[PDB]
Symmetry: D2
Subunit: 416 residues, 4 copies
């Protein structure tokens, strides 16, 4: 008794929000992937932080390394609501990175982390969209009596090449850890699945420092948490597994756990339109596990009449507050804040990131419009293949990405 409460308090989170998401290719080109928008108003680092709040861990470390001014701004504006006097804060560590990343990146700020005097460090990732409690994870880490606890999940074998694959024992003890294998070794029972890592580790902190120095001296290591550190603990035999279904926060218990690594642009589009469906897989209307963001004041989403006095028919949409839609059939889309949309437009299966200004008679289909574009009048997008692969970036699955640069290069005056 009195364990699940006293475990977060003695613990501190380290969010590794220094990813780039190179497979998004342009969407994270001007922003760190953790600062990528998602789900109407939120960002991808609003999940990994919220999970720390609602699990009790109010001491967070946001390691913003690569191309992070908007991430600093978001963490400053929305998440600076802490009274440090009671040992709660989201400490915004800049990395000043020297390749040689994420676990050297916890090592550069090793002299700041120590001064928290924490017993259990949570090594998170801030580029994933999950919904988990770590208070149920730390209990499971301390009961087993391990030094490190990896959060693993069974994923398909065709995409398990991109995650850290592992094999566990009866008591969830790591025997064999391999990382990004070309041939993912399946689980013993199911051949179509592999028990892969999620990037959510938990160390007992006095080990962790004690480990990161042995690797800091190491000149032959990659200095990654999944390539030369956990494959070292695994040989030591002190690494245990924590099956993710035990701690995933679900609204209904009859569904598979929801952990989406955004990763690429088509998966971003899928995982951001699944909220616009009838019954979403991610329940954002939850009140026993809410997710916080930088709540900005916008006016209500305005729906006015078109230029001819007609009406706008919005089906399976996710129009957010602040927009102004004039007529314009809007299907299966997700309109972020301030997305003006003028008349006679047909928007189907689109993700319009904030402040996108769509001109008259525009027919957008299966696309992702980047922030603060000015789409001209009469521009069809997504109802052509060879012509949408030449101006904008069309992916292998049909998805289009419209950036504020691709429109400038065509000459459509994005200055506004």
């Amino acid at each position: 008794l009195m364990l699940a409460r006293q475990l977060p308090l003695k613990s501190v989170a380290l969010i590794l929000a220094g990813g780039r998401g190179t497979r998004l290719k342009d969407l994270t080109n001007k922003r760190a992937k953790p600062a990528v928008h998602f789900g109407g108003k939120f960002r991808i680092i609003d999940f990994a932080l919220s999970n720390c709040i609602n699990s009790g861990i109010r001491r967070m470390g946001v390691i913003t390394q690569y191309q992070s001014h908007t991430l600093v701004q978001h963490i400053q504006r929305g998440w600076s609501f802490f009274n440090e006097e009671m040992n709660e804060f989201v400490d915004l560590l800049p990395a000043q990175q020297r390749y040689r990343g994420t676990a050297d990146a916890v090592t550069q700020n090793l002299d700041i982390i120590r001064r928290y005097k924490a017993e259990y460090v949570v090594i998170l990732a801030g580029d994933h969209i999950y919904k988990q409690d770590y208070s149920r994870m730390l209990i499971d880490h301390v009961e087993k009596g391990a030094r490190c606890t990896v959060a693993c999940m069974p994923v398909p074998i065709e995409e398990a090449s991109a995650f850290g694959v592992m094999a566990v024992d009866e008591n969830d003890k790591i025997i064999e850890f391999v990382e990004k294998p070309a041939n993912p070794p399946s689980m013993p029972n199911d051949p179509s699945k592999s028990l892969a890592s999620m990037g959510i580790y938990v160390f007992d902190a006095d080990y962790l420092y004690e480990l990161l120095e042995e690797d800091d001296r190491d000149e032959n290591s990659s200095h990654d948490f999944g390539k030369d550190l956990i494959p070292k603990i695994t040989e030591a035999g002190l690494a245990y597994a924590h099956p993710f279904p035990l701690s995933c926060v679900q609204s209904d218990p009859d569904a598979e756990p929801y952990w989406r690594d955004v990763g690429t642009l088509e998966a971003y589009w899928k995982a951001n339109l699944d909220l616009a469906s009838v019954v979403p897989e991610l329940d954002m209307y939850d009140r026993n596990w809410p997710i916080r963001t930088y709540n900005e004041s916008l006016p209500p989403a305005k729906f006015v009449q078109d230029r001819s006095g007609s009406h706008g028919m919005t089906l399976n949409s996710l129009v957010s507050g602040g927009c102004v839609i004039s007529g314009s059939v809007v299907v299966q889309s997700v309109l972020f804040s301030r997305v003006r949309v003028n008349s006679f437009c047909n928007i189907d299966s689109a993700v319009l990131l904030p402040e996108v200004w769509v001109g008259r008679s525009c027919r957008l289909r299966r696309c992702v419009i980047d922030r603060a574009c000015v789409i001209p009048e009469g521009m069809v997008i997504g109802e052509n293949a060879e012509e949408d692969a030449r101006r904008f970036y069309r992916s292998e699955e049909g998805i289009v990405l419209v950036t504020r640069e691709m429109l400038r290069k065509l000459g459509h005056k994005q200055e506004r």
Copy 2:
């Protein structure tokens, strides 16, 4: 030279947010009128607070006469963003009036007001809707060498009986002030209008005090700013006027100034639907003069298909965050937060306050639904007048008010 910015600093606002809005019969009988919702996200009082921010007066006094626990909460959550040590704050002054009109609310808390060490005090009576720049008014107050400055606007003579009417000379100096007359006098040039007050007085700091005590040691006055004090000052000739067009904040200078005495319920429906029309009179999309409110983290305005799979139509509407609409043609309406409209409904020119849950097959027309009011399936409002006057409260013009306690009569269990 340097007087335009040193006048707000030496001034303090006194919002007399202790109205009860008696003409708002059942809408305000649970909450004080300053705490009434208007325009999706805002409340009435926000205006009279935001006009104090943008006009530089960052020291406010909210003189909340009781019936309000829901505006103490609103102030404490939204407007508790001040550093009280750099001389900027929103002092929440409980009125604690004797179980004794407006002035006797400033008198009881007159020992708390002196300690602000102010120079010009801005009496507001801020349970109205408008956009004003009070610094303009302070400049006009000091330029004239006045002791009280009343903000006067010409209004129609058929309504001037509700307000204090005044008669000024060439210098905008008050000649004749009559408070709430049965036969309002007209202007010397326009006989159809009347130069009425607006509740916005600006007094000298060291005079009001010397004037309240002299009026507080009396046993004959009603202790009201309009009936007793302003006539007392007019008798001395130290009362000057400020035409409100000079200090009104208009996005378009080709319109007429926007001051709504919201409290009628027939005018609380027209001013709330005024933001749903094609071109509104009150611009909420103005960035040089933004209005702030308590901005909680709501998910986007979700639109989905009906139970059969059809689409939803919207024409000249507002849909704030948290709303969920399924099919159900909407017209001319305004939906506040978390308004789960269900399928096959027909909403026309309605104000749906927060957390209103409209049931299936509900035809709502010219109505004002109080907050958290769970309308049942099949209910029909606004069609046959005698029915709606038999169950709900219907004003003389046609507007209907629906309250939580109003349906429990009819048996429709609420318990949201």
Copy 3:
């Protein structure tokens, strides 16, 4: 397993901060006793709030019965650091009691309390000084399968008449409860002590409601938690006890638990000087259980030379920020913020509340100076008892209270 941290989440605290501290004759006759200063920077209520934070109960209800505008302000400035949308907040509930004891303050705001959707409600009566962990108490409450848990501590029999005395069996189940007796009963093993209550009850959510209505529809009860409800529950046998040593937060486990019923003025001087001594009983330097307050930006405690150029001595004292001392030997004293002690003074065992301006050549001994009290030059306090009983209020033990209104009698103009 996972019960230690899921009990605070499903619980809400109700601080009955509506005491008037009648034994604090003139110290609280302007401010409610929860808003009284103690220990330099803190107020009385902070304790009962901070114990709710550190114990995980981040949903509080401050049931402030009126005479308090200076604790509404304190809550709104200091403790308005919550994100109210992640289920953590300090609801400031005005009591608005009929011009009807403690329970009838929870009854009027019983329609606001249901909407929290709580499971265990923590009645506190938080106008005391202590350090407790309520989560320990909730664990002990659910382990016993109880319906109300009373926090009992043994106190001396010569004072137990002030509190409710109880008699428990081996299971800590209440046998006999007598509220504020004239002849308190003693314990079966120690005849010099009495197992008294502490005002800290923990009720089931769905029972209290069902118990308040049953007691609110009566016209015979006093509507007090000690006189009516707890005896009513004892009669059913569903009242269990919680020894307070089990849940007290002690830096040293070799001391006795620290609970001060501050209100006597002779005990508000001893408990405030207890922090000036060599080793205090209440540790304010504890980092695993910090106590928060409103922390304004004050400059350091400046010490300077006298008018002649001599030095100042301090022995066993506290000097908070903003203070300014010039020479003037200080002993055993406690100086609150902005206390400009001037030269040639001799302060011995005194409590100087904020903004006290002591004049030149002032000899202060065994006194409690109210806040902003400008003592004049040459004043002498605590030397000759009959004089201090002729001008100020002097308790039977020797302690003196000095108030702003107390000096105006004598002619010493204050107007700081």
Copy 4:
């Protein structure tokens, strides 16, 4: 009229808080000079920011470039109190500097600054300790009708080699600007003084961008605001002067203006002990122009008895809140937060930065003890010259600097 108010609103501040203060030599070695402590609780960037608040410019740009994690932390914790919805914020730009500094450093973030849409940019410095209003400066900049306005002051000729020297005209128009000359050209009237620049410029913003690009293309420039930019505007003839005495905020008007460039270690010590004097030159007890910092909750400054039962005599000291002093004569010192000082110590003319733990019988004289040292027991400092120049850094004027590294190298176990 209506100018001094509307000028800050249309303006934005750019604080160049990227300095190192190379002449402090060790004090800024681990912190950006703007984050250097000063005056008990404050930092050097708490002035340059506060001057922006109390002058109306609530839009600030903090260009943190070099070795800034604590500066980010301070700006996040203390100065993140802004409601961006009303166009007020302290935007914390990281520079990611590529030598080639300060004016290329405003150029890297040229795409963020534009999006404010500001009319007048204030180019401040965050390494100086002044107290000025820029609302009186912008009026003086717009009346003259200049494109740039330099804040200049007459300083001595023996230290005018380290500032930008200039010569003005009758209408304060720059004729000749030279920068860090080896022979400072004096003023025409006074030969012992030179009219030097302060680093506080004001541009009309549409010029500024229009200028920074012409210099961004320039491959032969130093990219500094005082070496190849203002010496260019001066040739253009569009640079005017704003004598600092016109806008310096003084408590009393009979004193010379107070602008201290900390710069070196002896000037740091002088300018930080001048607050501990009887009548300081910098009035920090001002209420019409306060200075904000990260107000942390500490207990009052405790003064206890020594180990033998003696008393501590503090003369002309500035003991801050949080300390614990035991006996120990303390003269002319400045004790920052949490500075424990044990018994029998003699502290004369010292600056003890936060958390310094001084051991028993320590005799410190004319020194600056860096943050979080652990000074051992019996260690004399400053009462020897040849022995204080060999362990610690002794300056040419006698001042000593004790760092947490110089003590480790002696072997005194700074880990704590």
